[PDB]
Amino acid sequence: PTLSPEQQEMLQAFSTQSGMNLEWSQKCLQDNNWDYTRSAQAFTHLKAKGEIPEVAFMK
């Protein structure tokens, strides 16, 4: 339900970089072990395929 200080900073960074809202950014990071490099790769892979749900990019 809540994030550590370090996770909070990672979340804000990833939301900005990916363009996803905070909740979907948190989902991507959690799905990838709070590993930013891995999360970014995973995101980029799915984005290119057109498979990320459009709700992920809404405010």
Binding site: C28, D31, N33, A42, F43, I52, P53
Partner: peptide
């Protein structure tokens, strides 16, 4: 583990 997930896990 239903629904959308990111990365290879």
């Amino acid at each position: 583990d239903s629904g959308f997930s990111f990365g290879s896990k």
